[PDB]
Symmetry: D6
Subunit: 164 residues, 12 copies
């Protein structure tokens, strides 16, 4: 049994660890540096931010990951989606479930018209996970991000509600 539940202050500890792991943040072009105090101040800052919906992917025993619908625009009705499953719990398909539930939330609850995401071109794993759900590559932004000491190309992929 797996579920998605709103992010809570009490969970920031977990979110702290993830945000300070190099391997995880790198694949998503993030910086693996964030004090718990800064994370808590950011949680408080965006407490009423209706452009974001940060969730927690939880299995039958503990929290396993995070999934975020960010840049939620209510005029164009689209939003970016980000998924991060801790490598400790990779091996059990949590990413696909979290992705499906996040898509269902964005379309059926937030009434979004389109979802999009940026994925490292070399991250064929996540690329295939996304393609399985109906996401189609719409762009190839070359040298759009800098990580591991090099500029990396990123696929801009997306999915329309009409296609879902």
């Amino acid at each position: 049994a797996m579920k998605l539940r709103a992010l809570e202050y009490s969970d920031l500890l977990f979110v702290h660890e993830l945000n300070n792991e190099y391997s995880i943040m790198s694949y998503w072009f993030e910086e693996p540096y964030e004090s718990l105090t800064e994370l808590q101040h950011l949680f408080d800052k965006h407490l009423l931010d209706e452009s974001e919906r940060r969730f927690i992917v939880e299995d039958e025993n503990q929290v396993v990951g995070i999934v975020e619908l960010v840049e939620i625009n209510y005029i164009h009705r689209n939003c970016e989606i980000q998924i991060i499953i801790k490598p400790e719990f990779s091996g059990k398909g949590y990413a696909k479930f979290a992705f499906e539930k996040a898509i269902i939330y964005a379309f059926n609850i937030l009434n979004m018209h389109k979802i999009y995401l940026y994925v490292d071109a070399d991250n064929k794993k996540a690329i295939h996970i996304y393609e399985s759900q109906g996401f189609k590559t719409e762009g190839l932004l070359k040298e759009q991000f800098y990580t591991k000491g090099k500029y990396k190309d990123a696929y801009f992929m997306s999915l329309l509600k009409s296609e879902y």
Copy 2:
């Protein structure tokens, strides 16, 4: 023995659980997403908001639900009513008790002239529970809400004090 009491800060932990259940919030067109900190900040924000009266529905042993009189207008003397009995305690008549007690509170204490509510046209259970108390359908707002990925119609039902006590 059942009662309604004022919603307390200490009760938010329960309300939180209800505000994140998809099945519960859906029937009320709400969004099943709210951090405990957000709920607390909102409680603090509306602490002195006289347009709201959020009661907790409690039974002989523990809390069971929440009934709220919101959008209380004191010029037109009307307010919206919302009921949410946790499914764990469903089928015990708590909904009817809480709804009737809230009607009495609105008419006899708040001196309201009219009460109204929006109910999904498919929730015949709630429509019947409301009709039993005297609420009559006054409108059908088609595609008025959006839930479960579809636009849902809503009966605007209401009850007048004159119809409730003559």
Copy 3:
């Protein structure tokens, strides 16, 4: 042994209970709805309010009630008096003692020239308890309040210092 002391923050919980009992509040035309947080914010708000003196009525064992000198005007030298003894401790004469001590505080310490009160015209018990101390009815405000789904009249009663010393 009975006494009156100043209302303390730590006492608010007791007050909270009283402020949510419909039976206690209705006779005083108040609304039986108040979260503990709202009561605490109100206590902090009026902490320096010199127009109010809220005393706790305590018996030999525990707190039994509340008395209040509100709307204290220092130019006209008068103030409204309110008393509430929890029904659990009713029938033991606490209300008369609290009324006497509050009158003494108003006249001898606050240097008030007059005390007044509103009492439901049907509440003959409180009316006689007040008349015993010399409070005389000076007005009949018809339909002055709304409670229990009906408009209620109220006696405006009062006692001058010149009548208290005579």
Copy 4:
């Protein structure tokens, strides 16, 4: 032609003068002392106070008086009414018009159930003005106010909507 219009900051000057006249304030048990700065701070303080409705009685040429519905309670549905016409403009029936318009506002707009007022027992003028409109004496509060160096009795009068 006479009218009632919401009180404005720009009118406080007038309200200042009235509030510092002994003869006027005395009949209404008020204190004839108020700096313009204090009056402006009080106007700002009660800007969003929904328990009050302060108006201005204006004739065909200038402002003549003030009329206030205060202590507006929306549970018991009643409020106190106060009227003050500057003596310069006494002689033309402005008080009766202002009173009638204030009653109409309280009953037909604020949906009030009862209106009440305190009037000095010796103020037979205002007493008769009020009795003409249907107000009935409900109480005689003796020595309820102190002015001109003596305690004065005050009639508590009122009018129900059913009677109006």
Copy 5:
């Protein structure tokens, strides 16, 4: 030539005049009382309120009215519409132009799915002006408002984008 533009702080002087006219506010169940300072503080308060879009209706020479899209919900994708053309400029078709431009703004720019409004059941002028644009009566809320000392019913009318552009 007629246009709708964003409401500006400098325009409040006009809005003030409209917010204190009994005849205008009555048909919209509003209260004809608002100090210029209150209106300014409210404008400042809702400056960043994305649930509102308050347009001023202007003609070839001067301002004539105000049309507002309020209660903009971005989940259910619906909003309420309100029109007020000053009587001085009535009978010139400004109301129809402003209403149609506001409908277009809501459907084509705000990406709204439905528009609705409350109209007094006696204001057949406004009911007809709204029916001409495609609005259909979806409800009759009896005694829903209180104005001119009487409880007034209100037609809940609405228009769907699907019905407006297919």
Copy 6:
């Protein structure tokens, strides 16, 4: 024609001058140093201070002086009175009129039971001006103040309301 009115912010400039004249302040044991900005901040500070009533004494043409009812205590019902007529307008009897009107304000409007004042034992002019109105010396505080490089004694004088009406 002479009058007393409430102290206004616009009057502070006048006050400023008086508050920087050594001759005027020394007799009242004050310090002749006060920037206009400090006086304005003090006026704003005590704007809502109900313990003080600062009146301007105005003649037929211009402002001539200041009178003050300070340390107004509403439990003991007394207050200190202070008067200062600019030497430019001295000798015309303004001080006696201001004293009489201030006493009348304290007794008849503020409902004071007693008025008191401090006056330099050498200032026989002010002493006689006070004794004319019924103020009687109740104390001689020796070396109570320090001015002009010397410790100065002061008469504590006062007048009861019972003596003022008799």
Copy 7:
């Protein structure tokens, strides 16, 4: 062994009790009403108030009373003195010691030129305690205070440093 020590937040509990005793406050014309919260807010308010010096009179075992040098004026170099010994500990001369130490503080530390006090004319006890230390009656303010339902005369007494 007796001592005087600066008033501390931790001692306000004691100061609370004293301030709510009718018999004690009455003799000093104070009002026997004060919540602990108000007392703490007042302590915080006057934390940096250099016009006051509030002490605590402590014996060999516990706190017994309070003594305050208030209205400290540094131009005229004088201040009012107030002493309150809890009746429980009356019987042991704590008031005389506290008074002497407060006088020594005012004169030798604060460099005051004169000390004064108000004492109820009927309080012959405190009057004699003060006269023993050299205080001389300088005034009789009749009906200066109101307590126990009556106006009471108060002796204004004082002591110069030159006389001490």
Copy 8:
């Protein structure tokens, strides 16, 4: 002679006009609604925002347009570029000059590694103006925006510094 300067508060009025023209905003997928007060508050809000560089495009006589380097990221070293020339001054080549100067600012002063932009797939004029400077289409985001009552696709175009120096 044409130039680019920093956006000043005094310029906001001009911006205001541009930000309320439907024709100008629709092509950039913006909403043509913004009170002057909101624009001023936004200018003050982002005054210290180092992620944005908003320049005014000025000609020999007056201000003609705006250019903007927004979403400036200093880790990945890229930023979005936006340009708007008022239609009154269109056809004179101002847009190309502004684009060139903004690219030069981004690459030579901000040390950016890449610039990118969104442009409506139908706006062939802007597309060619961008392609002239070396911006190459890297993506086609279908139904990425909503304007004029229709979902619109957008080319994601961009230019690297290595292509600009080569």
Copy 9:
């Protein structure tokens, strides 16, 4: 005719001119750098600072200098004195008048017991002006200050009230 009056906000423009003259600030070991805004913020900061009494020295026609009693300690009853007469008005005896008036103010109004000052050991002009009034050298602080790129000694001079008036 010469006088000393309280320093006013409006006077800062003059003080500014003096606070940026190297020759003036040097003899007083101050730094000849201070923006008008800094001077204004400092005036506002010390507005209620009772440890300072900053007088402006004025003549028959215009302002000429500034004399200040700073570091006013009310336990030890001593304060430092500083004089600055603008060179334009030098050689007219303004310094002696201002210094003597300040001494009188300190001893006779502030009730100070001792006055002191630091003076450069080379400024024999100031040393003599101070000795003429009774100030006696009590210390020689070598290399106590740093000005004109060199460490300068300073005479600590002082005057007792007992020595000034016996």
Copy 10:
């Protein structure tokens, strides 16, 4: 006649223009972008900043330039010096005078022990102006700044008080 005077709010207009000129800011590695509002907020922010001393170089008629002693450290007793003369007024030796006066201020008034500065290696003009006053090159920081689309080397030069 030339002088240096403290920077004033009223002068920020001038400072605005200079700060938005590309040629000037480039030689000093600054960014030629600054709104007048931002400049005023920065002036207010550093109003009490004792680590800075910003002056204005003024000739017989108008303001000509700016000179700043920044990063004033009072432990190590050193500070950076920056000079900017508007090109309109280049041709009259204002830079040398401003530099000399700033050095005199830093050493003789601020009691500094050492002054230092960064100058573009290609800016032989300013380099020689500085060398004339006794400044000696202590370092060559290669690619220390980025301007005009290229990394530029900067001479770190300085002057001790003992050498001055």
Copy 11:
């Protein structure tokens, strides 16, 4: 083994004890009165005050005293020094160690040019302890302080870095 370390908030309890001892504060002309809350607020106030360096003097087992470098001026490069060793730990040479360590801190870390102090002319113990380290009497300020009900003279002593290390 002895050391000096920065004063910590947790250390205030000790400092409090020293700030209320008459014998200790007297020799330093301080007032033996300070609530723990006042001391804490002052510590918080001067938390970022670079003019002060308050060290605690600790021994092998526990805290023993406090040594402070105050009035640190960074233009003239001088500061005042104050030592207070609790009498319980007197006669063990802690004063000399702390004073010498503070001198070293001022000259070698803070880069001060001169150190000075005020000492009661009767405290020959402290005068000798200071002379042993090189401090030389530079002034005699008579009646400069007031303690134990008498005006006390004070030696202004000081030490130059040039005299300490040549």
Copy 12:
């Protein structure tokens, strides 16, 4: 196993110790004085400061040191690097690992173009530890700092990314 992590508030205590050791700070020209409260306020102050990246150097068991990338400039793309390994854990090579990991962070994550540092010319150990990683001396700032009662020269050393990848 050794690692670098982000500096946490809970780590400040460790930092506090290091920041009060004269031996550790002197080599980095810092002052060995800092209360824990000041360090906490500084951590909170720079919490959102993107110009700094303060890492803790941790070994297999406990925290051993600190490394810092400060003065991070994103236009010129450079930053200063600082390292401090507590002497207790010196000699185990932690400093070289921390330096390498910090350089990697600056170049590969922050995208820095150059790193630089100041090191005491006598600290040959740190100089060689830096030269091993490719840092080359670019300047000799003589008498650039003041510590241990003497002015000290410092090597300005640095490493480009082009040299790090080559």
